[PDB]
Design a protein around this motif. Sequence first.
Motif, short mmCIF file in Angstrom:
data_model
loop_
_atom_site.label_atom_id
_atom_site.label_comp_id
_atom_site.label_asym_id
_atom_site.label_seq_id
_atom_site.Cartn_x
_atom_site.Cartn_y
_atom_site.Cartn_z
N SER A 162 -30.66 -28.75 3.90
CA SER A 162 -31.91 -28.52 3.23
C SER A 162 -33.04 -29.35 3.85
O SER A 162 -32.95 -30.58 3.95
N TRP A 163 -34.13 -28.67 4.19
CA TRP A 163 -35.33 -29.32 4.74
C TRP A 163 -36.49 -29.39 3.72
O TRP A 163 -36.80 -28.38 3.06
N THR A 164 -37.14 -30.54 3.61
CA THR A 164 -38.39 -30.63 2.85
C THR A 164 -39.56 -29.92 3.53
O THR A 164 -39.53 -29.66 4.73
N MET A 175 -34.61 -33.84 6.43
CA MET A 175 -33.55 -32.90 6.20
C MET A 175 -32.47 -33.68 5.50
O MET A 175 -32.37 -34.89 5.67
N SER A 176 -31.71 -32.97 4.69
CA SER A 176 -30.52 -33.50 4.04
C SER A 176 -29.32 -32.67 4.47
O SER A 176 -29.40 -31.45 4.53
N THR B 165 -37.03 -35.61 -2.10
CA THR B 165 -36.26 -34.86 -3.05
C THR B 165 -36.22 -33.46 -2.44
O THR B 165 -37.25 -32.76 -2.41
N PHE B 166 -35.06 -33.10 -1.91
CA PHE B 166 -34.87 -31.90 -1.10
C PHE B 166 -34.65 -30.65 -1.95
O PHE B 166 -34.10 -30.73 -3.05
N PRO B 167 -35.10 -29.51 -1.43
CA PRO B 167 -34.97 -28.22 -2.12
C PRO B 167 -33.53 -27.88 -2.41
O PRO B 167 -32.67 -28.21 -1.62
N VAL B 169 -30.01 -25.97 -2.83
CA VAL B 169 -29.32 -24.86 -2.19
C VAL B 169 -28.18 -24.27 -3.06
O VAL B 169 -27.40 -25.01 -3.65
N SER B 178 -30.37 -33.01 -3.39
CA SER B 178 -30.25 -34.46 -3.30
C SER B 178 -31.58 -35.21 -3.22
O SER B 178 -32.62 -34.61 -2.99
#
Lengths: 213, 213
Positions: A162-164, A175-176, B165-167, B169, B178
């Motif tokens: 996941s990217w902000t 990115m996470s 604070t990531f989008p 999924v 997360s």
Amino acid sequence: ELQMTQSPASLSASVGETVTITCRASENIYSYLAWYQQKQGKSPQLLVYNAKTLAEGVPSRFSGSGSGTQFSLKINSLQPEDFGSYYCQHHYGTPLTFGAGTKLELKRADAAPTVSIFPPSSEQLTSGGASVVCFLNNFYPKDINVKWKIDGSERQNGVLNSWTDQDSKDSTYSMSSTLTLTKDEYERHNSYTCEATHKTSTSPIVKSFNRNE
Amino acid sequence: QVKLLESGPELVKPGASVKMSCKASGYTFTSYVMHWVKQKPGQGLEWIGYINPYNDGTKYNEKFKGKATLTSDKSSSTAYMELSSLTSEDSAVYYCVRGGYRPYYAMDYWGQGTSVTVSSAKTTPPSVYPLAPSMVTLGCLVKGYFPEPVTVTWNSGSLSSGVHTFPAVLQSDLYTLSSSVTVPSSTWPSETVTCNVAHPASSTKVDKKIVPR
């Protein structure tokens, strides 16, 4: 039906810089075109109607032009508040069709990520699952690759990423990366490795931990 | 002030229907038409049709013909849109928009919008798992909740700066997200760090303290 082609899809630029957004109608819409601005998480805002008249409040730096089938929106000397997305729309008749949209983002210098790896939480472990998390923070540009490795062998299954959106203060992205396993599969190995590949370096930034430490 | 007030979020099953509302104030409700606009997450704006509250007349986007029905109630300055035989492709934020009054009706006033999730998936609270290892990056993992959204803070907004604070999924019909927080090495763990997670669909509020392992 009536067709609106808006260009480009994405565009990048610096403050003080001038950009142009184009809108094409597939039929003579005389001058009945409007422009809107919308920021992440906000409702859209009318900027220009009748192809070139500014709405009230709208800074003068914004400027609509065109007639019939060719329209464009010029934003002069961009400012920080200007970054976000733009939409055109035919507005006197049905169908009041929208363009697809243009996303407008800020430029800055290439920036290496601050990578962090986190072991599965003990609380999650008691639930039967194990998530290994790794943050790749404040980097530029958006393109980046993360590779997961368990005892040194790559792993593709169970990886969610996941990217902000663009950061509004420093213009980087974050990115996470999550690798999900069960407590068993997980308990059955030791080395957990997060590798980040980015135009900013030749060597991937590797972050790691050993389950038994 | 002209103001448009929409109905709260919806979680519907596929094949079902939903009906939303738009309370209008601060102008003569009957004098301006009311448009409806659809926007799927991360995607463009899409016109649906509009209702004229004065004579109850309607005009629709061909595509939403027999998907959306529009209505209005004069007495209560209220606009309505019903969507039937709901499919996942109907999951989207929906807006009501006042129609200009020129000359050529430019859409000028947008409400906050109404979010609809068309899923068979069911309301579920999240599990909140800690993420512990001159700076330190701590984390918080929000797993398996539904529907969106959740809100994260750290120390009830005491710590605003240095948060990602990531989008969310979709992890197997449920959402995962997360959140990372960076703080000075000296301050932690002497000063406590806590992620405050809220999932309004389930009226659940969570508060993990980040314990150094």
